[PDB]
Amino acid sequence: SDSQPVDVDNIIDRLLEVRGSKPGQQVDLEENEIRYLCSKARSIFIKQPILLELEAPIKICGDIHGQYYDLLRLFEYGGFPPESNYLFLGDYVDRGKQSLETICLLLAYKIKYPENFFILRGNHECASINRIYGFYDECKRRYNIKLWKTFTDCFNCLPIAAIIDEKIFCMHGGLSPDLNSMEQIRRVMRPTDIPDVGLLCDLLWSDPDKDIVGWSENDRGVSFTFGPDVVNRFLQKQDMELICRAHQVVEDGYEFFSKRQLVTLFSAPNYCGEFDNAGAMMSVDESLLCSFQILKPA
Ligand SMILES: [Mn+2]
Ligand SMILES: [Mn+2]
DSSP: OOOOOOOHHHHHHHHHGGGSSOTTOOOOOOHHHHHHHHHHHHHHHHHSOSEEEEOSSEEEEOBOTTOHHHHHHHHHHHOOTTSSOEEEOSOOSSSSSOHHHHHHHHHHHHHHSTTTEEEOOOTTSSTTGGGTSSHHHHHHHHSOHHHHHHHHHHHTTOOOEEEETTTEEEOSSOOOTTOOOHHHHHTOOSSOOOOSSSHHHHHHHOEEOTTOSSEEEOTTSSSEEEOHHHHHHHHHHHTOSEEEEOSSOOTTSEEEETTTTEEEEBOOSSGGGTSOOOEEEEEEOTTOOEEEEEEOOO
């Protein structure tokens, strides 16, 4: 009577209520509502495979980094669920100052539309990184450290890659020298933190590099860079048409690599208030043709 079961439809309403407002306006979610979001989505993440098999049509977004009103802006261009299906590619928290609203809306939509809304792990969906780039501060300030740990236990169960109609391979970062076969991705055990070495690390951290042949060291201090030859060989070996990744700011919101064999998507316009970039959202139709909706910075 005083207690109630958490209602996901009700939480989505309060999250979308600030649509007509200024960036900065928060959303009071109750601490048990957020634990419900984390625990219910965690259960869905664990049931669903760690390598998602998805079907077009689908809209795809890159990094968000707590720019919550840009998340709302993306849904205004793409169609609020369930009007469009979605795949997000990671990096939901840190750097911006409304990571809480950002991840909460995504978890809510994962729970409400579990067969039509999908989110992948990025390298900022790890307790170690997000305790230096902002999400830890934000949870502590607005709630408490124990809630932040509820998020990271959930983050540790996030799927790590996706395949769209056997032809588009999707991940936050890039390829790995240890990616022997897709089965190796399916066997990655959850929950786990992101290691400093190995297949899972590279999937969430590696970068393409136009000026390299093969694999070289990554200036991020972790994982590697790969050249156009690496993408070419992987698509031949795996019989696929496109790698769709995020993880890097790109001026026009999207940017191809190795003769359009790989695309980088970035969905946070005017990233950090510094970069003057657009955001892009990639639309994949049943013919597996890709088009881009562009969100220029306000
Ligand atoms: Mn990022
Ligand atoms: Mn990243």
